[PDB]
Design a protein around this ligand. Structure first.
Ligand code: HEM
Ligand code: HEM
Ligand code: HEM
Ligand code: HEM
Ligand code: A1AH9
Ligand code: A1AH9
Ligand code: A1AH9
Ligand code: A1AH9
Ligand code: ZIQ
Ligand code: ZIQ
Ligand code: ZIQ
Ligand code: ZIQ
Lengths: 346, 346, 342, 335
């Protein structure tokens, strides 16, 4: 019969700790911590990949089309964000190691680095970090540090469909964008154009003041932004610059879901969007906590490379965050009368 | 040169995941989570054992006598409590698994259980959980479930000196208890006896009242407690009953440190005492969070056994917690005379 | 315009700290911490009541009948559990206060206690802690400590519909229980009866294993069939060992088993959140007890230790549905025919 | 006798919630959360100020000279770190509010802002954030937004001695720096110079290239003028002597007299870290709520211009082999 230690293959897991300081005849106690910490990180990366790959497959193989599967999708994404939340907290363990003490074994580590985490890279890639959007380290590609089946895996990760791509595809199919249907984008442009007109009238009416002057300038700004939403070419341009990532139609789908999130069919889809943003947030918080530690340990340069990874260029779903820019009054939102509610009702 | 994956023997760590559901031709997704969670726990237990064993050795080998080593001792104990804090939070990850989903692979796990965690047992033992006071599960001894070098290791863990025993030894050597020296115990008994007398007079003077009675009743209770501290035989009795764990002299040492904690030589010792209590607390919080989950997963015998492990019967440093019972007014505390104070400097 | 400090009425919030040790001419530093900690707890209790009362209203006014409201309901319940998670962590702040230091101002507190938190009680009540099932303190009822409008509010809180009651009501209306419809309960009894038989046949196929298998089977059979004894339920209900109506229990199990069906996805989330709130409330109680121990020693401790029991778990029924888990293949197949109803 | 609600003045605390959305006849549910969150933050800031001011006083009144007070000092600093850790987690509560929902009451807030947290500013100042090194928002001074007793308090907070200043003073008095005593700085320069030479005596090019880099850094430690210059720029904060005291404590931390002082240094760095983490978590949220200047201004607060104890972090840069560290034989350890 099956025993715990065997079920968990602890013969492997708990015989994987080799202090290099010890191997070279100068055992340093805190090296053990350094080893375990990373090994735990790698376990959890493996788990995250497990969840993420599973969700990619649900999209890739069209199961997501069957909306019964949305609960599973959101659960696993949420689980990823829970794991990441932990991985952030896990830095607290390694903060128990002083720089002075780390200094006593750092030499036996050269020339190895976290940079060589295949899994971390797989994770970046599978979520949808693009190579053109990557900061080079020492003017080199991240993959040039990897060889063999490893380089092969990393390629597959780059070449196979990312979560971003798969979500984009799914977002494009969001119900309500059909011009022959609810014509969301049309109704939205109209309602915003109308609404803005109304507002300008209001402001013009205001008695010549400095508040008014301010309100006028504000209006100009908002009007610009709000209408920029309907400039597909602006989008295509911002896409090429990598300031956006999602297709124009995917963006429409996402905003559809934002605005109509209470409608039954969009309740769990809205949760998914939230979770995708959570993953981006937590990944960046991981990067920041990593930076903050490397600083404490090595001083001021990897530090600056790392500091550069704490940017929106590494946020895959930055588009979802930026939909907050285009928030309008609720009353401007195209009406979902019972008439046109049925298509979003399950 | 050295590569990350090799340094961390990831060839082992990341090839230790064997879904039994998959091995029996019915892969269940959430099983992977269950495996990784446990594997992470076991990594961290290993680290805790590493820290704990190191601190045990510092005591057993008299390095703790050189007070330079106190910083190291407290840091590592604190590190243990930081890890435990994390392990408690780690349950949040496994709470992402529904009971319904766990039910879909629980069959392939029989007859294995967490009970078979050698390391968890080693940890209990090395801290100082006593078998005499271990709740039996289904009329079984915990060790009877283990065989081979495992059973051997568990025995060694039981027989070799525990942290409690080693701390006890060290506490017995606490400066200030010397009757021919500061005579803390003597001065304390005197000051308490005197103080209590004084209070009684205060109350006796009061006029008969329900208040007076309420006060007299309280005084009797306090007097009882405070004086029970000087009944060595009561202690020896409670020791045999396992309601206390520390020698009478170790108890004196601990209270010495509590009362004079601001004195330089006692500052880090007091920190150590705090950390020992923290470890007990977090260990029991681990047990409670484990229970809370087994309930959500299996419903309500195991559950009840587990609920019973969340008791003071498992609290190794219960004596340190209970020194709060014997708090006296500050002014009752034997004054540290300038000459005397010298013995607590470095 | 509006100023931050005024918007937040900080003239009140940040002039509410009066050290009693200082008022009596012996200021103790750590008293300040003790005050702030509690004040923060109370702020968050107020917020929890705000969320909880809002959700109660959505149920009581029948808005929950319109399923567009489910996202809001689950978000606010989830928000409650997030606040509670914080309130648990908040104990870590007060653990920075030593018992020795607390001892230096404890006297100036008498005879006040956390016990007198009106809000904590309102929260217990509004979730659905029953007075009859409350552990007595000092051989007396919790409310005897309260007077005036406070006692009045506490009564209202006890008498007005609890979250449990309102969820019960809603669970009773769960689709699928209709005997004329999917007849879940019927199909379930049948499928379990059948499934158990099939297992016995497997088992009937002598060994140590066999001995074990049959013992397991016996209990499982007992448990699973006990589910269909409405009388046992009504009995356990009167004993307060269960809380939900038998019909509500059917609704809940319906949702468990068919949770992936779109209409049940967010409802299942709600059930999970209700259990989370119970769990976190218990974790708060445990962390409270653990601290009172470190501070006062060894007995309110014992009273408190008694509050960490199933007597205080309002949705214990939802936790215990794990007992009645069956193989997936036993679950009545959700008719593609009528699937559209769900 | 005393009642809980009265002891805690809950008549004030629990009657301080005024939804502006409600005051203007359009109550929005999530506004309540926004209010409470901030109120909780402010309570905890008050507590932090209480701890911090107490520690400042222990330094300023010379009690820290009596080393029995070090336990109290480190406990309270650690307590600050624990509160800050909580305040970081507290953002998770407000993350339960969607941008869509926040949008429904944001209007009733104009023109109010977190910027106007007197306490947050008092906290920045009392720790030792320098005004000249503060990034302007909208080409404006932070204090310009405050008037009355508030502006007065903020000034006092700027003018009275900061934690940094008080720690600096104390670090300068670290035992061991006496040239006539252990003569740490000399022993250090000597041992380093010697060891570096030996290394030179000993890919090879890259190693030599690295050695040159190393040597540069290590020797830069003894350039008092470089330091004084970097000090005036505000790229460093501590006096040259305080820096020596700190490094003394780093290297000899195991020595009993330095055990708790080393803990203090660690905690000062922890407070810097946690303050920055607060700033970052605030940013990461304003982004999800407002989208996009504020975000970027805030991203600028995650600069080391806001790290008061940056000197303590950077002592990791000047790390030598242990065997280079001047030996503390008990005779000269007697202290
Ligand atoms: C003492 C603690 C640590 C130090 C000093 C440290 C140092 C560094 C440095 C300097 C780099 C930049 C590449 C290089 O120059 O070698 C780096 C990158 C990295 N580290 Fe760490 N690290 C630490 C802990 C960790 C931990 C716990 C993880 C967990 C897996 C980790 C994972 C990584 C990863 C994945 C990268 C590449 C990041 C990217 O390219 O965006 N490191 N680390
Ligand atoms: C699905 C999650 C879990 C379930 C259902 C579960 C179930 C159980 C049960 C029923 C027991 C009591 C003994 C028995 O009946 O075999 C037990 C004990 C134990 N479990 Fe778990 N467990 C879970 C997760 C974990 C995790 C994450 C750990 C991490 C190491 C763990 C470690 C243990 C240990 C060490 C014991 C023995 C405790 C003692 O004897 O004091 N379990 N578990
Ligand atoms: C020094 C810290 C604390 C001590 C010593 C303490 C002590 C006690 C004691 C002894 C009781 C039992 C009733 C009594 O005998 O007076 C109690 C109950 C209670 N305490 Fe605390 N407490 C502490 C912190 C807190 C905090 C931070 C809260 C936050 C609100 C709190 C809330 C309560 C509540 C609500 C009760 C009633 C609980 C129930 O009946 O189930 N206490 N406390
Ligand atoms: C909906 C949530 C929040 C939003 C949208 C928000 C927005 C902003 C913005 C845009 C700024 C930049 C200054 C300005 O434009 O007025 C700011 C600054 C600030 N916020 Fe917030 N904030 C939020 C929550 C909080 C919370 C919970 C705190 C906690 C008290 C807080 C404290 C501050 C502080 C202290 C500043 C000034 C920071 C500095 O100057 O470094 N905010 N906030
Ligand atoms: C396993 C092994 C090593 C690491 C590191 C890591 C990375 C860089 C390190 C280091 C540890 N100790 N010193 N350095 C020097 C920094 N150099 C190295 C590369 N060239 C320029 C920067 C992090 N995680 C690990 C896991
Ligand atoms: C690895 C493997 C298994 C586990 C468990 C665990 C423990 C008990 C379990 C279980 C999983 N699934 N069903 N049970 C039945 C409980 N019974 C068994 C003994 N007789 C009464 C209770 C926890 N962690 C694990 C790690
Ligand atoms: C505000 C004020 C006080 C509290 C307490 C609290 C409650 C009871 C306490 C206490 C603190 N310190 N000692 N006790 C004594 C416990 N018993 C003794 C026997 N008679 C009844 C009281 C918790 N939160 C508070 C907030
Ligand atoms: C109480 C009241 C408001 C706040 C904010 C806060 C600050 C600025 C906000 C906001 C909320 N919502 N929108 N803005 C606009 C940002 N503008 C203002 C200045 N001009 C450029 C940026 C945070 N905490 C609060 C507490
Ligand atoms: C049938 C569909 N699930 C349509 C779809 C796409 N994105 C959505 C978001 C919310 C609701 C529905 C959708 C599909 O084609 O996947
Ligand atoms: C020399 C000594 N380390 C003395 C000692 C024992 N316990 C203590 C507690 C606090 C301070 C000192 C001690 C020893 O005998 O180990
Ligand atoms: C229309 C309805 N909301 C039906 C209902 C009740 N409970 C449920 C649980 C899950 C799904 C639907 C329901 C009502 O009658 O309120
Ligand atoms: C006597 C002294 N406490 C000297 C002092 C300053 N910093 C220190 C650090 C560690 C040890 C001692 C000191 C004082 O003058 O305050």
């Amino acid at each position: 019969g099956l025993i715990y230690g065997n079920y968990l293959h602890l013969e492997k897991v708990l015989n994987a700790q080799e202090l290099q300081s010890e191997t070279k005849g100068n055992k340093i106690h805190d090296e053990h911590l350094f080893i375990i910490t990373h090994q735990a990180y790698e376990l959890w990366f493996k788990q995250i990949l497990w969840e993420l790959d599973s969700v990619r497959e649900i999209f890739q193989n069209g199961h997501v089309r069957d909306e019964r599967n949305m609960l599973k999708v959101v659960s696993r994404m949420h689980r990823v964000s829970v794991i990441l939340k932990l991985l952030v907290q896990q830095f607290s363990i390694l903060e128990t190691m002083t720089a002075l003490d780390f200094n006593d074994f750092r030499e036996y580590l050269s020339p190895a680095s976290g940079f060589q985490s295949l899994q971390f890279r797989l994770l970046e890639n599978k979520i949808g970090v693009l190579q053109n959007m990557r900061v080079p380290y020492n003017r080199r590609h991240y993959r040039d540090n990897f060889k063999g089946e490893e380089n092969e895996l990393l390629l597959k990760s780059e070449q196979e469909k990312t979560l971003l791509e798969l979500v984009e595809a799914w977002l494009e199919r969001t119900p309500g964008l059909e011009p022959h249907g609810f014509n969301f984008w049309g109704k939205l442009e109209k309602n915003i154009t109308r609404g803005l007109e109304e507002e300008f009238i209001r402001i013009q009416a205001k008695e010549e003041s400095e508040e008014k002057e301010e309100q006028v300038a504000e209006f100009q700004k908002q009007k610009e932004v709000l209408l920029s939403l309907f400039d597909e070419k602006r989008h295509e341009h911002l896409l090429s610059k990598g300031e956006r990532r999602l297709s124009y139609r995917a963006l429409q789908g996402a905003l559809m879901i934002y605005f109509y999130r209470e409608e039954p069919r969009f309740q769990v889809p809205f949760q998914l969007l939230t979770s995708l943003m959570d993953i981006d947030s937590l990944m960046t918080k991981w990067r920041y906590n990593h930076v903050c530690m490397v600083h404490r340990m090595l001083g001021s340069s990897g530090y600056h490379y790392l500091r550069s990874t704490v940017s929106d260029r590494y946020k895959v779903f930055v588009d979802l965050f930026n939909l907050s820019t285009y928030l309008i009054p609720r009353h401007w939102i195209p009406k979902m009368n019972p008439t046109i509610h049925k298509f979003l009702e399950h």
